[PDB]
Amino acid sequence: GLDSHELARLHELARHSHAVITRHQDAGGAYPAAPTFSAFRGYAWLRDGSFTAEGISRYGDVASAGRFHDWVDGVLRRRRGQVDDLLAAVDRGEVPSNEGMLPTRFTFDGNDGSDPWWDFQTDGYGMWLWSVVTHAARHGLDLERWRAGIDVAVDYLLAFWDRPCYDWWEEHVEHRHVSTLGAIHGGLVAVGTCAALRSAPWSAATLQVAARIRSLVSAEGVVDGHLVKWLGSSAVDGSLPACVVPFGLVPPDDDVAAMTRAAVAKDLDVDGGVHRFAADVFYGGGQWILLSALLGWNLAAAGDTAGALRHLRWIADQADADGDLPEQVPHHLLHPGSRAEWVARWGTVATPLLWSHGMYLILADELGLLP
């Protein structure tokens, strides 16, 4: 379904995506979120990094992806005692405050880059488990290389999966977000169904907790046949298709998958560019490359190759003269009056966003289009 013109361009954007991710990978293995964006420079996220790593793993750069997993593993093993102390606190009936939880932003040397009171999130730990397992399976690697870090993440998530936290977008700490729950589920199912991990002490528990997550989403996270943004809401969020592919709450052909893809398309997808959520005012609420890629990935997995391609083409159209993909573009803005103050404060939109490139690689690969 692509002509030679399109193929050449999409192949080039794939090569460039690989190049810009690997060129900016830190010496210690972390993937930065956005090396030139003021507010993000110097920091790594497990969310961004895990999707980036999956794109790189699909592309076939085993070395680069492995260095990312090395980095994350080492960062997590260093938190073994912090996690053990959090668990001991819970066992004494002294539930830790958000301020004591594991961080969202990491520095490249593995320290807290931000204060979790202000940005506590559990999704990234779930994404990392999904990513490392998927990588190891793809390339025939021994997970013992990263196991002790996996153990920290699993223990943490088994204890804290059901806690309110900020969403992927760093908002609404009091709620429980379906794409956060989904990310955790995906990680837990990945480890709980991995034969190499069959003897882990937590093996059965991971699948039981994943089932508990699905119970919670069934009870409070589905309305009118579609997933919703957070438990007890009616609205959708552009992150929700991740709950289908890759995180596996429901198969791609499930009615809830179909209805969720349709609700996201209707409420949030303008001309192929997917918004985060209706109330989004960040940079005026623009169209996010990674979310168009996520929707495209989900459409491909459901057999809607044409829909997947339309989203891939939209993303390619947002590459700048160097091939770099921004976080978002303003062709359609949900709240245009809010944009100028974000631009004043933080500068122009992050570009390249490594996660944008990682998602592009995933969707290109799903469509068989890597060079």
Curated annotation (Swiss-Prot):
Record's keyword terms, sorted: Carbohydrate metabolism, Cytoplasm, Glycosidase, Hydrolase, Polysaccharide degradation
Intrachain S-S bonds: none
Pfam family, one: Glyco_hydro_15
EC code(s) of this entry: 3.2.1.205
Active site residues of this protein: 167, 170, 327
Gene Ontology biological-process annotations: polysaccharide catabolic process
One annotated Gene Ontology cellular component of this protein: cytoplasm
Family matches, as Gene3D superfamilies: 1.50.10.10
InterPro entries, per the entry: 6-hairpin_glycosidase_sf, 6hp_glycosidase-like_sf, GH15-like
Reported function: Involved in the intracellular degradation of the cyclic tetrasaccharide cyclobis-(1-6)-alpha-nigerosyl (CNN) formed extracellularly from starch. Catalyzes the hydrolysis of alpha-1,6-glucosidic linkage from the non-reducing end of isomaltose to yield beta-D-glucose and D-glucose. Can also act on panose and isomaltotriose at a lower rate. It displays low or no activity toward CNN and the general GH15 enzyme substrates such as maltose, soluble starch or dextran.
Protein name, per record: Isomaltose glucohydrolase
Species per Swiss-Prot/TrEMBL record: Kribbella flavida (strain DSM 17836 / JCM 10339 / NBRC 14399)
